[PDB]
Amino acid sequence: ESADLRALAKHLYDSYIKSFPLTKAKARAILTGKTTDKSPFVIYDMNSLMMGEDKIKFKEVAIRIFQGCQFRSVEAVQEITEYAKSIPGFVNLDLNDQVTLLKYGVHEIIYTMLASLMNKDGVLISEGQGFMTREFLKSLRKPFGDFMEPKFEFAVKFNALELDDSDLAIFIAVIILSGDRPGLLNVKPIEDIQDNLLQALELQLKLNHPESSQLFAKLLQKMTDLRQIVTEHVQLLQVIKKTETDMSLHPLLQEIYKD
Amino acid sequence: ESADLRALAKHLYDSYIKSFPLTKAKARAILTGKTTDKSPFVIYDMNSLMMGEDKIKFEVAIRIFQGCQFRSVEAVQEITEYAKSIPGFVNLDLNDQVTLLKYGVHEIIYTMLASLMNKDGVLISEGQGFMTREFLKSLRKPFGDFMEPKFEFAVKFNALELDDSDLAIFIAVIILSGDRPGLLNVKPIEDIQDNLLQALELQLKLNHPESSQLFAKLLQKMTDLRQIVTEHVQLLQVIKKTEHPLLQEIYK
Ligand SMILES: O=C(O)c1c(Sc2ccccc2)c2cc(Cl)ccc2n1Cc1ccc(Cl)cc1
């Protein structure tokens, strides 16, 4: 029945609101100039980089950003995990599976919501207080100049679909409850929920975006882009783990990463 | 007007059946042997336990309370789904919704843990098990005292013979407690609790006419509930001193 799906859309939107303080809609207000939010201090060079500790709340310059990006990730992990817990069925699954959905589905979800924070020119940082240009990032040191660039490439392809937060919440769920991830014990109950999530999404996109022909297919097809950018990341991470054996990864991120 | 409260009373009860798979009527049948159709595997000492993972699919004392937490999390989800059926619950400020559940869940979980409990132990795994109280008292410290206070409370609580139709309005009242720290807009909250309480007060009289001042005795147990949770949280404090990083994060 329609009504059962649209009621599941409501439920997940609501959890998404309750688990993610910087929504895409908050993000876009800041990035355009609406008077519902005030303005970001742009960081675009080492000079601005250094009023940045003064103005907005917050060792090589390139690495200090990394360990900042890395701390943001763990907060984002902490946040997606809370959102999964609301996904009907998820907590009832086997527990070894729950950790395997999270461990693999987390990064794909990061880079999806990181797109809400990005436009062609840069990325909000610090709960929106900051904004860091794409040009600054790509100009950093020879391992680090290439970390956020393919994130940007995806985000501009992705943001063109013009999803709002309420669509995103359902698409986030499908991502989590995949069923094709390595090491799952009972894929069938997973697949059964994801079938329900896909149904919900399918309806939701047709209702929210009635002129957007085949947005469902175009949405789901972007699950390929995400996969590939997780792959470049992991590989790129292991380079600096031995360029700077000085630098440390936080334990929960450590667990996520199982080469 | 009493029609609305009788109407609220069944709207909640129906929502409670949809939200909670294992009801007190259901449990009660299993405990008393009345419904002989199925009989729960019982875990009375060590060797019954290791045998129990085979029958009911899921150190020893650690694995036990660890499984005790997995079900809390499941239960929280069933509570949350129920909450959203309470008239006007979803109409409140999303922050106030999160705060009512943040502080309300534990009180509700021991309440419905009481439906699962008699003098001698507690039903486990959707009732397909029964773990003896004496087996859980034999656990290592601090684990041998964990469920002992809860057992104490359930016997007193189960002594007010409440049914699921009662508990349905009761626990609603727990959730609309306007004194949870950090609320932003309390009027609507207290506005719903004063409605739940009217409906609970009527429900107690009609369902328990011979039970004198039961309303009052129910409201007094909410002292024993709050005291229980306080007592619970800081034993999880001293278990943070005795014992995947992904797992710790699912369990907050
Ligand atoms: O998942 C279960 O059914 C369960 C469990 S899980 C378990 C089963 C066997 C050995 C260790 C843990 C449980 C454990 C204890 Cl010490 C007390 C009550 C327990 N239960 C029953 C329970 C039901 C509901 C809620 Cl809210 C919390 C607990």
From Swiss-Prot, chain B:
Disease tied to this protein = Defects in PPARG can lead to type 2 insulin-resistant diabetes and hyptertension. PPARG mutations may be associated with colon cancer.
Which organism is this protein's natural source?
Homo sapiens
Please provide the record's keywords in A-Z order: Activator, Biological rhythms, Cytoplasm, Diabetes mellitus, Disease variant, DNA-binding, Glycoprotein, Isopeptide bond, Metal-binding, Nucleus, Obesity, Phosphoprotein, Receptor, Transcription, Transcription regulation, Ubl conjugation, Zinc, Zinc-finger
Q: Name one GO cellular component term.
A: chromatin
Looking at the record, which segments are called Interaction with FAM120B? 1-46
Identify the residues that the record assigns to the NR LBD domain, covering every copy.
4-252
Kindly list the positions annotated as binding rosiglitazone.
Q69, F70, R71, S72, H106, H232, Y251
What does it do? Nuclear receptor that binds peroxisome proliferators such as hypolipidemic drugs and fatty acids. Once activated by a ligand, the nuclear receptor binds to DNA specific PPAR response elements (PPRE) and modulates the transcription of its target genes, such as acyl-CoA oxidase. It therefore controls the peroxisomal beta-oxidation pathway of fatty acids. Key regulator of adipocyte differentiation and glucose homeostasis. ARF6 acts as a key regulator of the tissue-specific adipocyte P2 (aP2) enhancer. (Microbial infection) Upon treatment with M.tuberculosis or its lipoprotein LpqH, phosphorylation of MAPK p38 and IL-6 production are modulated, probably via this protein.
> What induces it, per record?
(Microbial infection) Expression increases when incubated with M.tuberculosis or its lipoprotein LpqH; induction is TLR2-dependent (at protein level).
Q: In which tissues is it expressed?
A: Highest expression in adipose tissue. Lower in skeletal muscle, spleen, heart and liver. Also detectable in placenta, lung and ovary.
Q: What is the effect of changing R71H?
A: In colon cancer; sporadic; somatic mutation; partial loss of ligand-binding
Q: How does it assemble?
A: Interacts with FOXO1 (acetylated form). Heterodimer with other nuclear receptors, such as RXRA. The heterodimer with the retinoic acid receptor RXRA is called adipocyte-specific transcription factor ARF6. Interacts with NCOA6 coactivator, leading to a strong increase in transcription of target genes. Interacts with coactivator PPARBP, leading to a mild increase in transcription of target genes. Interacts with NOCA7 in a ligand-inducible manner. Interacts with NCOA1 and NCOA2 LXXLL motifs. Interacts with ASXL1, ASXL2, DNTTIP2, FAM120B, MAP2K1/MEK1, NR0B2, PDPK1, PRDM16, PRMT2 and TGFB1I1.
Record protein name field: Peroxisome proliferator-activated receptor gamma
**Covalent link location (Glycyl lysine isopeptide (Lys-Gly) (interchain with G-Cter in ubiquitin)):** K18
Protein localization: Nucleus; Cytoplasm
The GO terms this record gives for MF are: alpha-actinin binding; arachidonate binding; chromatin binding; DNA binding; DNA binding domain binding; DNA-binding transcription activator activity, RNA polymerase II-specific; DNA-binding transcription factor activity; DNA-binding transcription factor activity, RNA polymerase II-specific
Family classification: Belongs to the nuclear hormone receptor family. NR1 subfamily.
Record text about domains = The 9aaTAD motif is a transactivation domain present in a large number of yeast and animal transcription factors.
Positions spanned in the full protein: 235 to 502 of 505
The protein's PTM annotation reads:
Phosphorylated in basal conditions and dephosphorylated when treated with the ligand. May be dephosphorylated by PPP5C. Ubiquitinated by E3 ubiquitin-protein ligase complex containing FBXO9; leading to proteasomal degradation. Ubiquitinated at Lys-18 by TRIM55 leading to proteasomal degradation. Ubiquitinated by E3 ubiquitin-protein ligase STUB1/CHIP; leading to proteasomal degradation.
- Membrane-traversing stretches: none
- Record motif 9aaTAD, residues: 245-252
Q: What is its main location?
A: nucleus
Which GO BP terms, alphabetically? Answer: BMP signaling pathway; cell differentiation; cell fate commitment; cell maturation; cellular response to hypoxia; cellular response to insulin stimulus; cellular response to low-density lipoprotein particle stimulus; epithelial cell differentiation
